[PDB]
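User: Hi! I have a protein structure encoded as tokens and I'd like to know what sequence might fold into it. I'm fairly new to this, so please keep things simple.
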């Protein structure tokens, strides 16, 4: 428990950005969702994994 929710945003931003298939557009989208909800960071990550998976060489 902390008075700085921003930590989650620093957490998810790099996590999402660490996706080998994302682009500044998709990551920022997740980074954008982060601001909209810091607790969702994992979900944004999830969505990121989803976007990355979508942008994957499959």
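Assistant: Happy to help. Inverse folding works backwards from shape to sequence: for each of the 58 positions I chose a residue that suits the local structure. Here it is:
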């Amino acid at each position: 428990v902390d008075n700085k929710f921003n930590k989650e945003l620093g957490w998810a931003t790099w996590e999402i950005f660490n996706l080998p298939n994302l682009n500044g557009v998709q990551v920022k989208a997740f980074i954008d969702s982060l601001r909209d909800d810091p607790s969702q960071s994992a979900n944004l990550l999830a969505e990121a994994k989803k976007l990355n998976d979508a942008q994957a060489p499959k």
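A useful reference point when you look it over: DSSP finds three helices and no strands in the chain. Feel free to ask if any position seems puzzling.
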